[PDB]
Design a protein around this ligand. Structure first.
Ligand SMILES: [Mn+2]
Ligand SMILES: [Mn+2]
Ligand code: NA
Length: 613
């Protein structure tokens, strides 16, 4: 109803129908149309035609370029002000701050950023009214997880960015079938705007609409809403990627008895024809995507990829920890990707892939630091800043946070169960970090409780600073980290739960000259072999103050040699005394009153074991 003509947006719909939408979806779309004032509303169908025509359109407006060397590949170059997630502008809204972050004992919380409901309403009002003027509001119905999976969750993202629509088609399952499946069910409300209403009030840089000054990425778990303004980039704009997949989902998981985690999922098969699934949480630049798509050097071993970033996991009625990859593609950091580091990634990204902030070669190909392959004489490079570039220039040819966005179905080693609705049974959980000193190649937690402590104690070289990144979730906690620790610990008391073995890895231990003690890459399959045996109950471990390590001769080093196993697995009293002190100080300050008894107990236990060496 209306007394005039400004509430019903039916006449502005250029694809689909408001009438055909479920009631709450229409209310969401129409209410935000009233607010944002788009010129048109396009209800996405997810069809190849829609996708193809939108890409062609972006190409005409100078927003993307076709990469002619490859099959249906594209390149976007951004405003240099808009190149990454911005933590300081990423907030969670709850009635009480304590529900979002623990109240630290002495310092500022680094476990999240809380914003009051009142501060957010003011921020919202100063950003969204009229923000889509002159632009199309695209309505993206998407599923996080295989369609109809008991573990899947549905979202609807509204955006004024065609770049976002195209990337969301790759990264999620989107389109009409999602709407039809949703019906009158619940969904996560996702609202995004680049914040550049037309006519433009500020200069457009590199044909990339953004509003750096007003950039704000907000999460409202109680309202089931994600609201993001001012950035068109990655984790800020593709609202499934981190906002939904980790922040909202972890809070939903807390409520519902499951886990939403920053973990790859892989399937590994041994020479005896046995297959196991493992999950792994690593901080940035620790070889996460490399492990997920690893090409094992050990004969008769196979690794297959379920996911490279996010895992949604739930203990079923039988006690198995069943995990799905809630994503539909890989949004990988481009620099450092080579045939040596990730041959399978190379194979994936040469078709139907969108690249962002990488360099472009004169023959329409892609280039970045660490690509590790020469260009034929003649082939020149345009940097990510649209300038001529030479391999002896001062600045990198690709932004360090540049990306490929590629369909998961294209990975040559994608797991056959990667979209099974039931999920895959997780038998091991691997934590990791880049530690040049002190931390052995691999160890195994003494118990579930010790394992949760190991996750909580995670640290990694940011290098000349060792920073904390518990569970690799520091930028992504949807709620109080103390309560998250409690939630994890509670899994041990769940009837019939089969708790996976927990391991910690360090590929990056160096000698006193600064050279890596472990060859890494495909040789990491040797570490995975040891884990596989341990899960099977193999008597291949030796007790140390930090947990179990491989026995002498347990680790398969055939084909290697001579590897300094003594240094690689060396455990120093002095190092670990300091290590446990830093963990203690961190947990006391950052978790404080919300630190569970059992985590404090594990800290005490580790202290004691170190004291006795
Ligand atoms: Mn990630
Ligand atoms: Mn307990
Ligand atoms: Na551009």
């Amino acid at each position: 109803p209306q007394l005039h003509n400004g509430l019903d947006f039916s006449a502005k719909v250029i694809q689909g129908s408001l009438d055909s939408l479920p009631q709450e979806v229409r209310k969401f779309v129409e209410g935000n149309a009233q607010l944002c004032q788009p010129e048109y509303i396009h209800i996405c169908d997810g069809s190849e035609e829609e996708y193809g025509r939108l890409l062609a359109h972006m190409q005409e407006e100078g927003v993307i370029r076709k990469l002619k060397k490859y099959d249906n590949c594209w390149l976007a170059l951004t405003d240099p002000r808009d190149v990454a997630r911005i933590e300081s502008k990423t907030v969670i809204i709850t009635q009480e701050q304590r529900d979002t972050v623990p109240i630290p004992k002495s310092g500022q919380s680094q476990l999240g950023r809380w914003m009051s409901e009142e501060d957010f309403e003011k921020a919202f009002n100063a950003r969204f009214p009229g923000c889509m003027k002159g632009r199309t509001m695209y309505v993206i119905p998407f599923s996080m997880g295989p369609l109809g999976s008991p573990l899947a969750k549905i979202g609807i993202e509204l955006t004024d960015s065609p770049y976002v629509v195209a990337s969301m088609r790759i990264m999620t399952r989107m389109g009409t079938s999602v709407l039809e499946a949703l019906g009158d069910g619940e969904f996560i409300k996702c609202l995004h705007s680049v914040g550049c209403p037309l006519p433009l009030k500020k200069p457009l840089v590199n044909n990339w609409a953004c509003n750096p000054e007003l950039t704000l990425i907000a999460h409202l778990p109680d309202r089931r809403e994600i609201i993001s303004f001012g950035s068109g980039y990655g984790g800020n704009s593709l609202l499934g990627k981190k906002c939904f997949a980790l922040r909202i989902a972890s809070r939903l998981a807390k409520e519902e008895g499951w886990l939403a985690e920053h973990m790859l999922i892989l399937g590994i098969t041994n020479p005896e024809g046995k297959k196991k699934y493992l999950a792994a949480a690593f901080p940035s630049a620790c070889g996460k995507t490399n492990l997920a798509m690893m090409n094992p050097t050990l004969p008769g071993w196979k690794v297959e990829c379920v996911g490279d970033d996010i895992a949604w996991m739930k203990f079923d009625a039988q006690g198995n920890l069943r995990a799905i990859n809630p994503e539909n593609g890989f949004f990988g950091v481009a620099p450092g990707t080579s045939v040596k580091t990730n041959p399978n990634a190379i194979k994936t990204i040469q078709k139907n892939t969108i690249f962002t902030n990488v360099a472009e070669t004169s023959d329409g190909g892609v280039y970045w630091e660490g690509i590790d392959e020469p260009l034929a004489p003649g082939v020149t490079i345009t940097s990510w800043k649209n300038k001529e570039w030479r391999p002896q220039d001062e600045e990198p040819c690709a932004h360090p946070n540049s990306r490929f966005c590629t369909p998961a179905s294209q990975c040559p080693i994608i797991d056959p169960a990667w979209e099974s609705p039931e999920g895959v049974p997780i038998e091991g959980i691997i934590f990791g970090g880049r530690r040049p000193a002190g931390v052995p190649l691999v160890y195994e937690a003494l118990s579930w409780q010790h394992g949760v402590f190991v996750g909580a104690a995670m640290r990694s070289e940011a290098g000349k600073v060792i920073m904390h990144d518990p569970f690799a979730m520091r930028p992504f906690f949807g709620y109080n980290f103390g309560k998250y620790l409690a939630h994890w610990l509670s899994m041990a008391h769940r009837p019939a739960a089969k708790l996976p073995k927990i391991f910690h890895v360090n590929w990056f231990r160096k000698d006193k000259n600064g050279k890596f003690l472990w060859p890494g890459f495909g040789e990491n399959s040797r570490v995975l072999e040891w884990m596989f045996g341990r899960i099977e109950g193999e008597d291949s471990a030796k007790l140390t103050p930090i947990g179990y390590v491989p026995k002498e001769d347990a680790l398969n080093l055939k084909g290697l040699g001579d590897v300094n196993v003594e240094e690689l697995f060396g455990i120093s009293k002095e190092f670990w005394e300091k290590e446990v002190e830093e963990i203690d100080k961190y947990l006391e300050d950052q978790v404080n009153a919300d630190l569970p008894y059992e985590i404090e107990r594990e800290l005490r236990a580790l202290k004691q074991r170190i004291s006795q060496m």
